[PDB]
RNA sequence: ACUGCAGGGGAGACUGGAAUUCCUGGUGUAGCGGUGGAAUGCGCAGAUAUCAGGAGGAACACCGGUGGCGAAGGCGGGUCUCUGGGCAGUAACUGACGCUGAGGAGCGAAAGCGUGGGGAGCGAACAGGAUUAGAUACCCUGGUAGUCCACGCCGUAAACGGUGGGUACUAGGUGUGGGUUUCCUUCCUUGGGAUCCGUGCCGUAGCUAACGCAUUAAGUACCCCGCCUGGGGAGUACGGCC
Ligand SMILES: [Mg+2]
Ligand SMILES: [Mg+2]
Ligand SMILES: [Mg+2]
Ligand SMILES: [Mg+2]
Ligand SMILES: [Mg+2]
Ligand SMILES: [Mg+2]
Ligand SMILES: [Mg+2]
Ligand SMILES: [Mg+2]
Ligand SMILES: [Mg+2]
Ligand SMILES: [Mg+2]
Ligand SMILES: [Mg+2]
Ligand SMILES: [Mg+2]
Ligand SMILES: [Mg+2]
Ligand SMILES: [Mg+2]
Ligand SMILES: [Mg+2]
Ligand SMILES: [Mg+2]
Ligand SMILES: [Mg+2]
Ligand SMILES: [Mg+2]
Ligand SMILES: [Mg+2]
Ligand SMILES: [Mg+2]
Ligand SMILES: [Mg+2]
Ligand SMILES: [Mg+2]
Ligand SMILES: [Mg+2]
Ligand SMILES: [Mg+2]
């Protein structure tokens with residue numbers, strides 16, 4: 001999932017400075033793409049219990065970067081939730 | 088009253104019995120005299136001696152239908168397996184080739200449970 | 205556009221004249237969807253190793269197509285319904 | 300000692316039923332790894348070329 | 364797709380209904396509707412021959428084309444999938460490309476807007492009708508006719524399908540939904556696919572009146588009768604009926620097919 | 636993040652051959668089967684055997700190992716579609732975002748349960764034969780549920796390495812699985828040296844009541860969690876939750 005020419009468009013919109021692969025904006029952006037991509041794989045294929053566990057590792061990793069980005073700057077946190085979604 | 092010059096002999100040798108049938112190359116039985124036909128009953132049928140009398144009673148009754156040369160297809164995990172090929176030779180049959188056609192499944196059907204004897 | 209490779213086994217009672225026009229109507233479902241067909245090599249008659257549906261001979265054709273993933277699953281659906289075809293084995297080439 | 304690691308870019312192919320005459324025995328069965336000298340990775344490719352070549356009937360499942 | 368009601372009343376404690384999730388356009392086509400009227404089981408003499416019939420809800424006959432002989436090569440389009448109170452399946456309104464409207468029994472997986480071919484050059488997709496000569500062996504078919512051009516008569520309830528075993532020279536062998544291996548002619552026509560609405564056998568009709576609407580009038584047992592009325596009747600308390608089980612007309616149970624019927628030469632194996 | 640790489644890791648659809656069983660037909664005729672020894676049973680209304688054709692279900696010989704993968708339960712006929720994780724290298728990026736986790740939530744062999752399909756082989760229950768003082772058993776011949784599929788429930792195993800997770804350190808010898816990289820390097824040997832990640836055997840310090848463990852610790856230390864407090868009564872009662 002997420003070929004190398006498909007992750008570039010997500011890094012151009014949420015990354016900070018043209019090489020940013022590591023910041024919490026660019027990682028919540030990529031992990032929200034993979035969570036959304038893997039939920040179509042779970043609408044068809046209900047019984048894929050071994051890919052659904054990889055979903056909960058990505059969910060738990062995204063929530064820790066949300067928790068981190070809501071501690072160092074509350075302004076970056078609001079302008080990232082509104083572009084993707086909470087609840 | 089038949090006359091076929093070349094034949095095929097099938098020997099099924101199990102742990103309880105042996106059966107020697109002799110066919111034509113199309114697979115049609117001439118004579119089949121086994122280890123219970125030759126007079127035996129019980130555990131004696133699985134001995135090597137009853138195999139070398141089963142193979143004689145099928146050999147010299149295939150010759151009354153003119154069979155002068157057989158091919159040998161043996162199958163089964165039995166004791167009487169070499170003593171029925173050597174017994175077709177000393178009854179007037181040329182044996183030629185000997186092949187093993189033991190039915191070997193590719194782990195298909197499930198075997199019965201093991202014996203707690 | 206994934207590189208595929210399709211092996212077809214044809215009925216031996218067809219000559220080598222009505223083979224390249226025969227599957228040409230099958231290979232037009234690739235071209236009308238945007239695919240490419242590269243090499244439609246024909247091996248000819250060959251002795252089968254075992255009896256495939258009361259036949260001991262067969263005509264071996266190798267297709268070597270490069271198309272979409274949903275058009276090759278359409279191509280072997282139509283080949284497996286034609287009575288000229290015995291087997292089909294669709295294999296990819298890359299990793 | 301392994302032919303496929305020594306001589307590079309020799310593609311194990313299920314079409315190639317002349318390379319697959321060796322690595323199978325006289326009864327048609329796949330040879331063991333210790334009698335051919337292959338590595339683990341190329342024994343997997345040989346044993347996949349043979350199973351495919353039996354389905355397009357280039358090799359027999361059994362023979363006597 | 365069988366919805367279960369909540370136990371709000373003593374008559375819906377286990378009831379269920381079809382979900383009707385496939386029906387579009389809840390009204391029928393006007394020109395393909397003929398009238399009907401119930402009989403109550405009465406024949407031309409006015410007497411009950413089939414017991415336990417009557418009551419009922421008013422119906423109208425939808426004209427189902429079971430022939431499909433004379434539109435070979437004219438493609439059609441499924442306009443709607445509708446309800447039909449006469450049969451257990453659902454019906455499908457085909458708009459042919461020349462202008463005629465027809466209904467067919469809907470195969471499983473024939474959603475709205477498809478294309479249905481017919482004739483000897485059709486594709487083996489669900490919905491298409493072909494002669495049995497052109498269907499490959501192993502394919503699940505439905506609505507098969509017995510004689511060439513005589514109309515579809517086999518396997519046309521909800522869920523039912525025939526498996527085409529093999530074709531020898533001039534006769535095809537069929538496995539039918541009872542297990543009965545039958546041999547029919549190869550110029551007979553059959554629709555590729557299995558009949559839809561396959562979940563309707565699981566419907567728990569909840570109350571007694573819900574079978575009165577569908578037409579079933581109550582069935583009384585013979586053992587609570589009098590000996591003038593039934594062979595089982597009598598007995599001072601309650602009995603099993605002091606004889607072997609029979610019909611109300613004194614016929615013993617057992618095989619009732621005619622022993623030398625003309626179609627015995629087409630039946631390979633009786634059902635189990 | 637980029638670049639390479641290994642694999643029975645998972646789910647869906649179509650599909651391949653050997654064999655077991657039954658059916659139709661040919662040849663054939665008097666036994667087959669079974670055991671420590673036998674009988675019940677099948678057969679003489681044409682069995683077993685043997686050749687040809689067909690129907691159907693389940694399991695996948697050889698490769699296959701001391702080996703690979705997965706958090707564990709577990710996972711191997713082939714191909715296609717979707718999809719999870721790991722290792723190495725570069726050091727491009729964020730800049731402590733890390734560890735554990737009370738309650739909670741998901742997953743969790745087999746047997747079993749619900750509705751609906753399927754049913755070859757095996758086979759709890761059951762029936763007969765045998766053995767026996769008896770034989771509600773072992774053994775034999777039959778055989779239902781179940782084993783299989785779709786969807787739910789259950790939530791237990793000697794679920795085991797009887798050894799919770801993270802981290803640092805503390806002699807080596809020798810096999811093996813996955814990478815990367817200098818030297819006589821293309822004299823091929825895929826041999827040797829170095830290094831990171833697994834998986835085994837043997838072994839010093841150290842520990843242990845002993846057996847034993849030993850760089851994959853049960854050693855030397857730190858952080859978080861569950862648990863134990865004599866054997867029975869008992870993982871039972873009562874109450875509650877499911
Ligand atoms: Mg490989
Ligand atoms: Mg009148
Ligand atoms: Mg009635
Ligand atoms: Mg009364
Ligand atoms: Mg009275
Ligand atoms: Mg009266
Ligand atoms: Mg009376
Ligand atoms: Mg009474
Ligand atoms: Mg009474
Ligand atoms: Mg896999
Ligand atoms: Mg499944
Ligand atoms: Mg078979
Ligand atoms: Mg059967
Ligand atoms: Mg017979
Ligand atoms: Mg037979
Ligand atoms: Mg598989
Ligand atoms: Mg900086
Ligand atoms: Mg935790
Ligand atoms: Mg807890
Ligand atoms: Mg569960
Ligand atoms: Mg189970
Ligand atoms: Mg029960
Ligand atoms: Mg069940
Ligand atoms: Mg059931």
Ligand SMILES: [Mg+2]
Nearest residue numbers: 200758775776
């Ligand atoms: Mg038993």
Ligand SMILES: [Mg+2]
Nearest residue numbers: 761762763771
């Ligand atoms: Mg008993």
Ligand SMILES: [Mg+2]
Nearest residue numbers: 791792794870
């Ligand atoms: Mg426990």
Ligand SMILES: [Mg+2]
Nearest residue numbers: 708744794795
């Ligand atoms: Mg275990």
Ligand SMILES: [Mg+2]
Nearest residue numbers: 793794795797
């Ligand atoms: Mg424990």
Ligand SMILES: [Mg+2]
Nearest residue numbers: 799800801852
């Ligand atoms: Mg520890």
Ligand SMILES: [Mg+2]
Nearest residue numbers: 833834850851
């Ligand atoms: Mg190591």
Ligand SMILES: [Mg+2]
Nearest residue numbers: 836837838849
């Ligand atoms: Mg040791």
Ligand SMILES: [Mg+2]
Nearest residue numbers: 842843848853
């Ligand atoms: Mg200790």
Ligand SMILES: [Mg+2]
Nearest residue numbers: 865866867868
């Ligand atoms: Mg105590």
Ligand SMILES: [Mg+2]
Nearest residue numbers: 869870871872
């Ligand atoms: Mg309790």
Ligand SMILES: [Mg+2]
Nearest residue numbers: 872873874875
């Ligand atoms: Mg209680």
Ligand SMILES: [Zn+2]
Nearest residue numbers: 301304338341
């Ligand atoms: Zn190699």
